[PDB]
Amino acid sequence: AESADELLALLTSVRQGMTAGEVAAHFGWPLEKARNALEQLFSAGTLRKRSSRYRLKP
Amino acid sequence: AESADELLALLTSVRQGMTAGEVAAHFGWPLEKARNALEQLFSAGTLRKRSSRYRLKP
Amino acid sequence: SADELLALLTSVRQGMTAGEVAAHFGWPLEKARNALEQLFSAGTLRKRSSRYRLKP
Amino acid sequence: SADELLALLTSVRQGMTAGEVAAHFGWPLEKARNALEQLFSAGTLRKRSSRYRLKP
């Protein structure tokens, strides 16, 4: 019962937050195309974005 | 600039309503698999559904 | 023939679901769904497809 | 070498964005992003990827 689980993962992310990697994987798009889509909709005011954060490994 | 427009169509539908046909097209899935996904998530309480309605042509 | 179904749908201008049609005529659900889908494929009826949306 | 960057990140335990790093050191954004990505690829840093969400 993969498909219900894949759709639920997408729907949950739309609300909680999705990555370009996740969008690329669901749509079968290359990473740059997913990133562009998301960046354009962020610019357009459709999405909010939390920028990537880097921290020390333990 | 297709990809921003495709993503925006999906995101709009998640809120306003999506069809099995639309889900099949975005995910590259067969229709029956999209329908099953949506029906299972409707059963699970994740989604609401407006059933198909038929009316006379003019 | 679908004479009864079309007459019914002539009144209800917003349209009817297969379940509403099955209940009205006392037809099995499969029979209602197949009759409506047949009439849609023939161009007699228009169909608004089932839509699913997120709960708020 | 990334001696300054790692020292900075040693304090800020929740982590920093490339923009915050660029602002702190007065480095061009590309330089900040490349240095962090290099250190992430090397296994020195962990990275929480950018997430986008719908407006309510």
List chain B residues with CB under 8 Å of A18.
none
Interface contact A11, partner C, CB < 8 A: yes
Task: Count Cβ atoms within 10 A of the Cβ of residue B43 and give its class: 0-12 exposed, 13-18 middle, 19 or more buried.
Answer: exposed
Contacts of C24 (CB under 8 A, 6+ apart): C8, C16
- HEC profile for chain B? CHHHHHHHHHHHHHHHCECHHHHHHHHCCCHHHHHHHHHHHHHHCCEEEECCEEEECC
B53-56/D51-54 β-pairing = unpaired
Residue ranges of the alpha helices (H) in C1-56? 3-11, 18-25, 29-41
Domain boundaries, given as residue ranges, for chain B: 1-58
Sign of CA dihedral A21, A23, A25, A27: negative
Find, among C42, C36, C2, the residue nearest to C21 by Cα.
Answer: C36
Burial (CB count <10 Å: 0-12, 13-18, 19+), residue A58: exposed
C7: contact with A, CB 8 A cutoff:
no
**A46–B8: do the CB atoms touch at under 8 Å?**
yes
Q: In Å, what resolution does this model reach? A: 2.1
CATH number for the region B1-58 comes to 1.10.10.10
Nearest to A46 by CA among B9, D18, D50, D19: B9
Residue D46 has phi, psi (to 5 degrees) of: -105, 155
Q: Does A44 touch chain D (CB under 8 A)?
A: no
Q: What's the number of CA atoms in the CB half-sphere (13 Å) around residue A5?
A: 2
- Phi then psi for residue B30, to 5 deg, are -65, 150
Which residue on chain A is closest to D43 by alpha carbon? A57
Q: Does A48 touch chain D (CB under 8 A)?
A: yes
Q: Which CATH architecture has domain D1-56?
A: Orthogonal Bundle (1.10)
- Residue of C14, C47, C52 with shortest CB distance to B17: C52
Six-digit token pair at D14?
A: 């929740």
Q: Which residues pair with D53 in a beta bridge?
A: A48
Task: Please indicate if any CB of chain A lies within 8 Å of the CB of D13.
Answer: yes
Distance, C-alpha B32 to centroid of its chain: 12
Pairwise CA distance, residues D10 & D8, whole Å: 5
Q: CA angle, A9 as apex, B23 and C53 as ends, to 5°? A: 50
Closest chain A C-alpha to D31 CA, distance in angstroms: 15
Q: How was this structure determined?
A: X-ray
Cα A43–Cα A45–Cα A50 angle in degrees, nearest 5: 75
DSSP string, A23-43: HHHHHT--HHHHHHHHHHHHH
User: Which pair of tokens denotes residue A56?
Assistant: 């020390």
Measured between alpha carbons, how far is residue A22 from residues A29, A30, C53, C56, D53 in Å? 10, 11, 21, 23, 12
Coil, strand, or helix at residue C33? helix
CA separation for the pair A38, D40 (Å, rounded): 23
- Tally of helices (H runs) and strands (E runs) in chain A: 3, 2
